[PDB]
């Protein structure tokens, strides 16, 4: 009883529908085009995905609803995806400002850095433990959200695609994260031309690691052109992209 967690992962963040409305509420404001949207019936498709459901039960079309309800259309040439690399890749859209990460949508930023779950059998959520993808069960509510936001996301790309990838990490790119096992594979050769990945540094040529050659060779496979550059300071990066009036760049 008490003592115990049912699940290995953090719980739902605390006043999350709070939250989730709030930042509806915000995103409507600060992008007029989405002002249609009902914020409430934003929330009760949400809702609706999860609760009473198993949350290792969760399917794609239990978001179907909200996947409706969040419809929306990004430039398809100004898409930039990323992987393990989040806080650059937002900077980077923040300051340019015609470029789109999933998070930068209606949906992506309703749920970015939020964990939520419901419990078998009933209406409440559960804000003490949540499944974890690897030590659980993979079907659950945040995993199978992102997913299927993942997916769309990269099937609406076109012309050149922009990935940013974490370059003094472990693995650059990784075949079994979100951008390696759902996104890459639903880019459309017919509609994307290229995918242009941006390997940043922390601390020579990581574009010749075995993994971009994966990446290469996987892109390939699908008829897209690969192409590769280096960010060897991210910080002047970010400068250059501000001001790129600025001579040293
Ligand atoms: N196979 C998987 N099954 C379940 N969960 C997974 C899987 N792979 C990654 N994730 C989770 O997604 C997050 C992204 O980080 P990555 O370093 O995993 O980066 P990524 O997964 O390549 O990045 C996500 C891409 O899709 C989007 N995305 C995906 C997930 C979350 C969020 C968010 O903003 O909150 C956004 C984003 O637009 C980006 O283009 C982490 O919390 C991962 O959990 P773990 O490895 O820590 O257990």
Redesign the pocket.
Known sequence: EFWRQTWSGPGTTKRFPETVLARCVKYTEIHPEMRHVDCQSVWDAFKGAFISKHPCDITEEDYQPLMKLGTQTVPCNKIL????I?DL?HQFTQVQRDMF???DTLL?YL????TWCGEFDTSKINYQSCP???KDC?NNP??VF??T??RR?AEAACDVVH?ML?GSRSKIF?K????????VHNLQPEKVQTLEAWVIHGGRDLCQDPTIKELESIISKRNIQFSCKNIYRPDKFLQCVKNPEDSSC
Request: hydrophobic letters at 40%.
């Open positions: 995806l990323w992987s393990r989040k890749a990460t999933l998070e992506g749920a970015d850095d939020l974890d993808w690897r993979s945040v995993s992102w997913k936001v993942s996301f990935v974490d990784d079994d994260s979100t951008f390696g096992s759902v996104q």
